[PDB]
């Protein structure tokens, strides 16, 4: 999409429609005449364009109104009112831009931000951008959260996010121009290799994959057409549904072997009854011929009954020979209708031991995508965010993804090695109790108008708490926290002293021995300039490989790589790193997933702020004080960096709306 309409698409916004959010801020415009709406919509799209074409400088209202032409620049307040809405909700002037108007000399209101993940940083940038006092408390000794980047010599490899999922409407697109991110497109080709080390043949790879995708569509049909979404009072998972689909395909292979062999009995038995008439007929013929000889032995001249006997017997044996000729003609048709069926037998099996192994690799790929065993994903909802896929190829960040947090971090008041232990929020403000990670005895107190929580969902889930809320989170929030899923995938980073793999191949598979290890070291990435292979551990494997030493793990990696390239061509790795995200106390996992029994609506619950009760009973209903951001709070873009980032922008918008007011609604 191009022009002004491209800017609305690149901003995840319908170019020809007002959104629910814009209705809320412009209830005049949207309930008004359709002509004003097109003006507004153009003004939005035109402003978004201006920001998008150069996102390294701030877009001021003046700069904006100047480049609008009439009739659109006829109303200054409508333009001023649009530009302000955009700037507030981080659609324009977000990320890293030089300002034109330097910052307000004094700050208004104070906000504490827990965590300096991307979602933290993104709000903090914006809140500071709005003239607020922002401090981030971060438990680690580094910014970025689950954007981890290993660095040592020239070796660079991310342990966390590594893929930008396509720049078509991705906010990271804008951030990529703001920061020098080296974005290298992947190449989609992924050669599979089984446990022996032989490459899987092209015909088998294509066959299995198509069945894989056909099995996914089948589960979708079970879900939306057969309403197969509860099983014994429990939600059906995706994994269950795949079994139920595979079973019904193995059923149908047998249902149809039976029906085919049942065609051979039904015809071998027509033949049996016909050989029975033919053996009996060759006996009525054997004696009736005998009888005709005897009659013909009587020598002439004969009386006429003796002559009629020969003629009658001769006629009868001829009639009886017509019959046996017709019958050995049918007998010839059914003996061929039996060889045709014999040489046209249907498929013996649904999938062999070997095919079901290659299919397990494609299931490990789903397990990696959603960082969880398929037995936990909701059948109904696990892909509820598919409609908002970006367009374009996926990319990698070839100088390390950490370069983005670190960039966003610059200019901000960040207390590292500060672990929040208690959050207290009252009708009159908030206090956050944090401690020093290095020495727990040192204790810190932060007072503020608002706390923005971006604690990972695995942290929020932790029993007994790592962070205590005072007063406790209402049941409607804690139940969303329990219902949601927080998955796990891990990475092994192998640093070598030479490329020994296909350099024109970014990624290549390794087929598991068993279903249970389908996730154990199933995929390898060749993503970086240097010689670094990087090996995933998905599914049920992810949680178990965390109990195994680094050397036992790098051993299996070396084994696998030997089998595919031979023992001579694979050296020891110079440097090795193995992640353990579920073990990490500041993550407790990798990202979130729509658990069975959950839904995308739980993501909306995670995003609602908390409003404390009144201090003085009978006092006026207070302000909201505790706000949540992060990957698990954004319904349409969960478990991503861009979703983290967008959720920060979102909270910064509504915290600002709350504590600085919003003139753009008049």
């Amino acid at each position: 999409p191009s022009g002004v309409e491209g800017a609305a698409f690149q901003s995840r916004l319908p170019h020809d429609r007002m959104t629910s959010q814009e209705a809320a801020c412009f209830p005049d415009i949207i309930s008004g005449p359709q002509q004003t709406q097109k003006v507004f919509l153009f003004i939005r799209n035109r402003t978004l364009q201006l920001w998008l074409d150069n996102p390294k400088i701030q877009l001021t209202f003046e700069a904006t109104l100047q480049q609008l032409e009439a009739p659109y620049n006829s109303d200054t307040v409508l333009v001023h009112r649009v530009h302000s809405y955009l700037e507030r909700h981080g659609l324009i002037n977000f990320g890293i831009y030089k300002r034109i108007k330097p910052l307000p000399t004094k700050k208004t209101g104070k906000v504490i931000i827990i965590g300096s993940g991307v979602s933290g940083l993104a709000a903090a940038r914006q809140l500071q951008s709005f003239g607020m006092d922002v401090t981030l408390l971060e438990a680690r000794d580094r910014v970025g959260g689950r954007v981890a980047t290993f660095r040592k010599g020239n070796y660079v490899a991310d342990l966390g996010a590594m893929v930008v999922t396509g720049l078509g409407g991705n906010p990271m697109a804008v951030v990529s121009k703001q920061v020098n991110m080296e974005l290298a497109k992947i190449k989609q080709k992924c050669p599979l290799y089984e446990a022996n080390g032989q490459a899987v043949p092209k015909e088998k790879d294509e066959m299995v994959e198509q069945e894989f995708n056909r099995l996914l569509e089948a589960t979708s049909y079970l879900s939306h057409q057969l309403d197969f979404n509860v099983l014994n009072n429990k939600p059906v998972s995706l994994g269950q549904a795949l079994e139920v689909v595979i079973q019904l395909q193995e059923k149908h292979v047998k249902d149809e072997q039976i029906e085919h062999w049942k065609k051979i009995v039904k015809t071998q038995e027509e033949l049996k009854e016909l050989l029975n008439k033919m053996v009996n007929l060759k006996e009525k013929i054997k004696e009736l011929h005998q009888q005709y000889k005897e009659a013909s032995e009587v020598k002439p001249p004969r009386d006429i009954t003796a002559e009629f006997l020969v003629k009658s017997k001769h006629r009868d044996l001829t009639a009886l020979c017509k019959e046996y000729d017709e019958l050995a003609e049918t007998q010839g048709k059914l003996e061929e209708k039996l060889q045709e069926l014999e040489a046209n037998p249907p498929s013996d099996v649904y999938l062999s031991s070997r095919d079901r192994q290659i299919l397990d690799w494609h299931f490990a790929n789903l397990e990696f995508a959603n960082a969880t065993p398929l037995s936990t994903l909701s059948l109904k909802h696990w892909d509820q965010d598919d409609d908002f896929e970006f367009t374009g190829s996926h990319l990698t960040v070839r100088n390390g993804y950490s370069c983005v947090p670190v960039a966003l971090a610059e200019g901000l008041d960040i207390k590292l090695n500060t672990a929040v232990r208690q959050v207290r929020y009252t009708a009159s403000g908030c206090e956050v109790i944090a401690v020093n990670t290095r020495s727990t005895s040192q204790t810190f107190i932060y007072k503020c108008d608002a706390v923005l929580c971006t604690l990972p969902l695995g942290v929020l889930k932790q029993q007994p708490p790592a962070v205590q809320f005072v007063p406790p989170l209402p049941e409607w929030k804690t139940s969303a926290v329990q219902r949601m899923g927080f998955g796990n995938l891990n990475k092994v980073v192998l640093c070598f002293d030479r490329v020994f793999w296909d350099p024109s191949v970014n990624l290549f598979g390794h087929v598991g021995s068993t279903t249970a290890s389908r996730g154990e070291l199933f995929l390898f990435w060749n993503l970086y300039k240097a010689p670094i292979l990087l090996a995933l551990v998905a599914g049920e494997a992810a949680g178990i490989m965390e109990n195994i030493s680094d050397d036992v793990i790098v051993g299996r990696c070396l084994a696998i790589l030997k089998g595919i390239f031979g023992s001579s061509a694979v050296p020891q790795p110079k440097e090795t790193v193995v992640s353990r995200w579920r073990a990490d106390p500041w993550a407790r996992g990798s990202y979130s997933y729509v658990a069975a029994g959950s839904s995308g609506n739980d993501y909306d619950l995670m995003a609602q702020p908390i409003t404390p009760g009144p201090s003085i009973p009978g006092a006026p209903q207070p302000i909201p004080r505790l706000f949540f951001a992060g990957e698990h709070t954004i319904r349409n873009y969960p478990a991503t960096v861009h979703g983290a980032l967008l959720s920060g922008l979102r909270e910064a918008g509504r915290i600002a709306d709350q504590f600085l007011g919003a003139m753009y609604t008049l």
Binding site: R214, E217, A218, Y221, L222, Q225, L226, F228, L231, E243, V244, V245, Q247, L248, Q249, E250, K251, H252, K254, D255, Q257, I258, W261, K262, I264, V265, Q268, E269, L271, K272, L275, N276, M278, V279, K282, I285, K286, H289, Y292, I304, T305, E307, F308, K311, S312, H314, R315, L317, T318, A319, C321, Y324, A328
Partner: protein
């Protein structure tokens, strides 16, 4: 509206595989046994029929009679008349067979015989006698 093609998924079959924990394995063992079952009644009738086929070796070729080619004639000789009355008694109404007994007489002449020589040869009682048998 409809599944991917070749996928088999009706409301009846899903319930029968979910009804309990191994309700899957049961009904796919019901079918492995219903197919061993059929593949050896296959092999047993394929063997019964191999034996019936051994008895028909040689067909009926010793048992043939050559084809008599003889030009059809009009006049009824007394010998031909006598054969017909006996053919009528041994059959009755099967003009094709009678035509084949007499050999030089077509099926229309036989039917015409039935009424021309009806009195003199008392063809009436003859058929009564045949029907008793």
């Amino acid at each position: 509206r409809k599944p991917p093609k070749g996928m088999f998924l009706s409301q009846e079959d899903v319930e029968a595989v979910s009804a309990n924990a191994t309700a899957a394995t049961t009904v796919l063992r019901q079918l492995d046994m219903e197919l061993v079952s059929v593949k050896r009644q296959i092999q047993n009738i394929k063997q019964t029929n191999s034996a019936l086929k051994e008895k028909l070796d040689g067909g009926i070729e010793p048992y043939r009679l050559p084809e008599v080619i003889q030009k059809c004639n009009a006049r009824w000789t007394t010998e031909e008349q006598l054969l017909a009355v006996q053919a009528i008694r041994k059959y009755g109404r099967d003009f094709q067979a009678i035509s084949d007994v007499i050999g030089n007489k077509s099926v229309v002449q036989v039917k015409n015989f039935f009424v021309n020589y009806r009195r003199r040869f008392n063809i009436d009682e003859v058929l009564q006698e045949w029907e008793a048998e």
